[PDB]
């Protein structure tokens, strides 16, 4: 009612150990959401044309032309790790569990408030805030998942990551079909490559409105809203990484000579001529059995074209890859393809007290060794005469198409019926948790943006909006713009995510890699004297697992 | 029987999660024990007199004079962490449990073998090993705990720490009463201080024999032996350390001024004159309320005399302390009293392949801040006139007894009815697990050598011995020495220790300190090309706990 | 000391209640566990025993 709270704040995550090493994690998240009336009360169909930028030859990848529908509604998105767990909780999961199961999701809106800004344009022009007791907040839960799915995490537009900092929802918008043509070129490409925005295929047109599709709820202060419980359908997420390469599968060669003394140079030695060894290979015309040569059961990882833009009906797009590299060879310097990069703000990790508008960012280098060093690759003529002769080898060094900065690895693809790979690991806190599968006949084996894809059913999106607070003057037949009383609303959002985890078991003599605070990272987990806060990202499949 | 094994090898530690976050750890340990016939078949009463060494003034602490009974039996001791867990298991316990409960213990002897060395004193004098099928191993379990308790871990004489390395038991010996007088002196002490070994008080005499006190079992190959299950009685062991000092207990002062800017020098400030503040103190004659002055509820830790040797009926002995220091001030360099030091061999951590007879060692610096910086201590006259005047202060700097290298802190003691301390933390792998309480009217509040003291009941000690393998010639009335056939035995020992642990829960926003492998310690957990092995020690109460 | 670090927040640890005018809150009854307190003083010194 008016003087009665309709809800409870809860940002406690509970861990409840079951039988046989199964835990049931239930993450409670609560926020104060602030929401403003819409720019307009209309659906807008807008095109973005940065033709001018692509107009420079060699800049095609800078393409941003698209059409979208702008709606008067806001999206409440809470699908990002940082919304549900803190550095503390993450350590617990990641250091002690071995697999994660996303079970359910629930969210509710309570303690709604609507105020109206009245400006007493005085000397020092003043403004009074008053409560509009009979005003309504509009809530719409698209549970039949009618509207197109728009995960706010790919834009760092989720609820914020700190329970003691109010937040806001994002203006909901969705892609509208368009046709565009852009021919690639390079620095000094004579002429002006076609760069055309053709428009919309009429048979690809779908204009959606919330009002016509979802039931809308008006909540006044006294009201409250609650989604019920949604159960997901998803394969479990592993919290361990693999490290074995094709090169480390199965029985190693028996060493006929073993070091007699300790010493970084006291190697053991297979004792047999590479052309006189027993074993299996798939090199029917050779007697050489080496570790690069001996037969392995399948292939771990695959090679895919790099910095490959493909083009369809709407402009060029980057070809995605399931895993990047990093390790022995790649660090920030040994920079490659396949590793994701996250850009974000003060609400999701960028230091709170930091002044300046450059996003905060990071490149994620996983821990499962399933990628490639293209630099180590080589194709070689089937005769296999060995110190191979410059024209019986194709090295990542020889140029293709006569371009000196392109080699066969950039167009290379070794994916096939023997490829073995793993799904993507969780990215705390900026990563998305779940994703909607494509309603495509044949589906993708994975999604590079979320470890959890719900197939048959996903929770629907939640839309919110201040209903129109009209003034005394209102003429629906005027070609003008509806005049409204400046209204805004504050409401509390409470969400509940439940997971099921399994506890890890030691299996080696040696200890495992664990997340731990230390003298160098310590200050990243506590506030500043100013109260500045930051949320440094962390890794998740720290412990090893044997692949075979 | 002869061709039948009587047991199973098992060195698997099982972790079985129960309800409500309780795990039941059951540590299995198996070893191959090698045992030789006794030097003699007699009990020997021997005195150790290094008078010559103490004969140098200023060397009293080098005293080793004692009497002991040397017995023909060997002790099978498995009470040291390293016998039951590996680096791998320790990480699991220590990073994820919050308290440990020692529940029970069982051990058994199987697959007994007795051989006799026959030397065919040839050119190259040879020796044939043959099985003595009817020979017996003698086993004695002193379950009524009759014999004096002699934990082999204070001498690094436990079973060894690696399951794939055969081991051996220790020759059992126990202290026999003696009377000795040694007067301290120093470099350049005129004369020769009394240094006398008086002998034995007849009323303090207790000669014990295994034969007369415990039932002895003869096992032949076909036999086997098993202790049954013993349950211990012990308070739980905490796996967390405390960090709060008297200085960090309770409500901090309210700061009237807070930093406006971030900056390592942008402090906040109490805003009130130290002599104008409200609050409580125990300084009845002062109006100064400071953090060193304000009242705390009790005292965490205590001050005790350092490098204090005390003397009773049998020579001088070092006064023990419940906790040392280390941290801000002590590292290996800021070396102090209270921290234990462990010396050991190849069977318990010293690198296997290392040549050389110097023990391997380490000083254990715990993590609970409950010790003292004597250097920060000061006594000051009750008038409390403040910039205190050299003769109203006693500083760790002024000399006592006119000795310039002695100050009041070395003789100081602040233990009293407000002292709060914690029991000793576990030392993996060289530390003892359990200890027998003193059969004293009033008992010690703790034991500085084991986190677990069993009061009412402890498992009894296990004694083993090759029975006499006589030759054709044997004359019991000869004043000579019995001649025996050179016999030795190998048997398998299997022990089972069960613990009960509770899983930890995160309670802070920030992560905890966890044990983890890394590029600097990595090679301490895997063998050498030579097969060298080592077992680096680890810490155990890594996570913090609030004291108040 | 990084291993002695514990940052606590109310929000993450205790359930929070929002009360509006119409609301009210009540803790229930908590029972303590404590030895009794004497309301009398002693005056005998070692010098006055027996």
From Swiss-Prot, chains A, B:
Domain of life of the organism encoding this protein: Viruses
Annotated GO biological process: adhesion receptor-mediated virion attachment to host cell; clathrin-dependent endocytosis of virus by host cell; entry receptor-mediated virion attachment to host cell; microtubule-dependent intracellular transport of viral material towards nucleus; symbiont entry into host cell via permeabilization of host membrane; viral penetration into host nucleus
GO molecular function, one term: structural molecule activity
Binding site for Mg(2+): 144
One GO cellular component term: host cell
Transmembrane segments: none
Main location group: virion
Keywords: Capsid protein, Clathrin-mediated endocytosis of virus by host, Cytoplasmic inwards viral transport, Disulfide bond, Host nucleus, Host-virus interaction, Magnesium, Metal-binding, Microtubular inwards viral transport, T=1 icosahedral capsid protein, Viral attachment to host adhesion receptor, Viral attachment to host cell, Viral attachment to host entry receptor, Viral penetration into host cytoplasm, Viral penetration into host nucleus, Viral penetration via permeabilization of host membrane, Virion, Virus endocytosis by host, Virus entry into host cell
Disulfide bonds: 454-458
Subcellular location per the Swiss-Prot or TrEMBL entry: Virion; Host nucleus
Function: Capsid protein self-assembles to form an icosahedral capsid with a T=1 symmetry, about 22 nm in diameter, and consisting of 60 copies of two size variants of the capsid proteins, VP1 and VP2, which differ by the presence of an N-terminal extension in the minor protein VP1. The capsid encapsulates the genomic ssDNA. Capsid proteins are responsible for the attachment to host cell receptor TFRC. This attachment induces virion internalization predominantly through clathrin-endocytosis.
Miscellaneous notes: The capsids of autonomous parvoviruses expose a proportion of VP2 N-terminus and part of that sequence can be cleaved of to form VP3.
Similarity remark: Belongs to the parvoviridae capsid protein family.
Domain notes per entry: The N-terminus of VP1 is sequestered within the mature capsid. It contains a phospholipase A2-like region and nuclear localization signals that might be exposed by capsid modifications during virus entry.
Subunit record text: Interacts with host TFRC.
Name the record gives this protein: Capsid protein VP1
């Amino acid at each position: 009612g008016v003087g009665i709270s309709t809800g409870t704040f809860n940002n406690q995550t509970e861990f409840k150990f079951l039988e046989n090493g199964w835990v049931e994690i239930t993450a409670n998240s609560s926020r104060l959401v602030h929401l403003n009336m819409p720019e307009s009360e209309n659906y807008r169909r807008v095109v973005v044309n940065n033709m001018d930028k692509t107009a420079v030859n060699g800049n095609m990848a800078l393409d941003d032309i698209h059409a979208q529908i702008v709606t008067p509604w806001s999206l409440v998105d809470a699908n990002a790790w940082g919304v549900w767990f803190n550095p503390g909780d993450w350590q617990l999961i990641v250091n002690t569990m071995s697999e994660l199961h996303l079970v359910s999701f629930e969210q509710e809106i309570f303690n709604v408030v609507l105020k109206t800004v009245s400006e007493s344009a005085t000397q020092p022009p003043t403004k009074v805030y008053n409560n509009d007791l009979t005003a309504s907040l509009m809530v719409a839960l698209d549970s039949n998942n009618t509207m197109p799915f728009t995960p706010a995490a790919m834009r760092s537009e989720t609820l914020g990551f700190y329970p003691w900092k109010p937040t806001i929802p994002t203006p909901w918008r969705y892609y509208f079909q368009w046709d565009r043509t852009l021919i690639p070129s390079h620095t000094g490409t004579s002429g002006t490559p076609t760069n055309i925005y053709h428009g919309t295929d009429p048979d690809d047109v779908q204009f959606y409105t919330i009002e016509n599709s979802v039931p809308v709820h008006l909540l006044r202060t006294g009201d409250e809203f609650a989604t019920g419980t949604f159960f997901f359908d998803c394969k479990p997420c592993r919290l361990t990484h693999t490290w074995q390469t094709n090169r480390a599968l199965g029985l190693p060669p028996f060493l006929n000579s073993l070091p007699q003394s300790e010493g970084a140079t006291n190697f053991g030695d297979i004792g047999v001529q590479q052309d006189k060894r027993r074993g299996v290979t798939q090199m029917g015309n050779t007697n050489y059995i080496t570790e690069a040569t001996i037969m392995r059961p399948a292939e771990v990882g695959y090679s895919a074209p790099y910095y490959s833009f493909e083009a369809s009906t709407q402009g060029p797009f980057k070809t995605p890859i399931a895993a990047g590299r990093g390790g022995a060879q790649t660090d920030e310097n040994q920079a490659a393809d396949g590793n994701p990069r996250y850009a974000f703000g003060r609400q999701h990790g960028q230091k709170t007290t930091t002044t300046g508008e450059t996003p905060e960012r990071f490149t994620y280098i996983a821990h499962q060794d399933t990628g490639r060093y293209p630099e180590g690759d080589w194709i070689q003529n089937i005769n296999f005469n060995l110190p191979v002769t410059n024209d019986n080898v194709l090295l990542p060094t020889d140029p293709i198409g006569g371009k000196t900065g392109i080699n066969y690895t950039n167009i290379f693809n070794t994916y096939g019926p023997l490829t073995a790979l793993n799904n993507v690991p969780p990215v705390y806190p900026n990563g998305q948790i779940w994703d909607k599968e494509f309603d495509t006949d044949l589906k993708p084996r994975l999604h590079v943006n979320a470890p959890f894809v719900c197939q048959n059913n996903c929770p629907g999106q939640l839309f919110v909006k201040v209903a129109p607070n009209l003034t005394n003057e209102y003429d629906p037949d005027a070609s003008a713009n509806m005049s409204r009383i400046v209204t805004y609303s504050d409401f509390w959002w409470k969400g509940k995510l439940v997971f099921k985890a399994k506890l890890r078991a030691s299996h080696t003599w040696n200890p495992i890699q664990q997340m731990s605070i230390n003298v160098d990272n310590q200050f990243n987990y506590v506030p500043s004297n100013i109260g500045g806060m930051k949320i440094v990202y962390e890794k998740s499949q720290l412990a090893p697992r044997k692949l075979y």
